[PDB]
Structure 1
Amino acid sequence: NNELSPVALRQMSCAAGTTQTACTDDNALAYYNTTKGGRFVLALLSDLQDLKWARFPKSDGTGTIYTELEPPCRFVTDTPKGPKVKYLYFIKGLNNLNRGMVLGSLAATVRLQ
């Protein structure tokens, strides 16, 4: 028995955009896990087609962490929204285990087709 993710993870929102200063506000679904030394955000998700630069305020309030994305993958899900068409976005450089955990929790709890 070797499993993908016993004990799941959490998520709250963040901002995103197309280019460097295109960030307006909440446009994403950015998954994360809380490391003691700052929480690492894992997986973004978009109703928009082509985003390439998201941004997160610092734990100190001085700087801001930028996150540029790789090309998306499309999928549609079901919920009282009916057809729920989106594009998953993994922060570029995310390795295979992190994508595995994200997809695991997502497809396990969130409806998919």
Structure 2
Amino acid sequence: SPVALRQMSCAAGTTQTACTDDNALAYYNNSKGGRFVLALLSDHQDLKWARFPKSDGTGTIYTELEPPCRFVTDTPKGPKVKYLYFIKGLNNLNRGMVLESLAATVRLQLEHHHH
């Protein structure tokens, strides 16, 4: 059942060329095929591609995003408007997963280490 969602920074943009670097936060799990990206969380409202380098290091990958959902969140600095991007074709089951994970941060391991 551990289809637990992990997160990491990634490159995103309005065009494949426009992708540059840590421009967003990507939600993914390991559904066999290495890393499977489900959604992007960013401050930018017109992103259309999430970019990740291939596993074997032989090229790169660009995944398509659906138009984002705009939403507010509270923070120490105050309210903040964020954009949630589900990848194209993502089903409601996976959308729900992203949501719960977004609702409360929880470490997936016990050892002193990133999430």
TM-score, structure 2 as length reference? 0.82
Local SS of the residue matching 1:42: strand
Deviations 1:12-57 (A, max 9, x none): 1111111121111111110011234412111101201111112100
Aligned length: 109
User: For 1:111 and 1:7, how far apart are their aligned partners in 2?
Assistant: 14
**Unaligned residue ranges in structure 2 (runs of 5+):** 110-115
Deviates more, 1:9-18 or 1:35-44: 35-44
Identity among equivalent positions (%) equals 96
TM-score, structure 1 as length reference? 0.83
- Gap change, CA 1:83 and 1:111, over 3 Å in 2: farther
C-alpha contact (below 8 Å) 2:25/2:42 kept by paired residues: yes
User: Which is bigger in relative contact order (C-alpha 8 A, separation at least 6)?
Assistant: 1
- Is 1:99 the counterpart of 2:95? The answer is yes
Please report the RMSD computed on the Cα atoms of aligned residues, expressed in angstroms.
4.0
User: For 1:35 and 1:111, how far apart are their aligned partners in 2?
Assistant: 19
C-alpha contact (below 8 Å) 1:77/1:111 kept by paired residues: no
**Unaligned residue ranges in structure 1 (runs of 5+):** none
Aligned to 1:6: 2
Following TM superposition, where does structure 1 have runs of at least 4 consecutive aligned residues deviating by more than 6 angstroms? 110-113
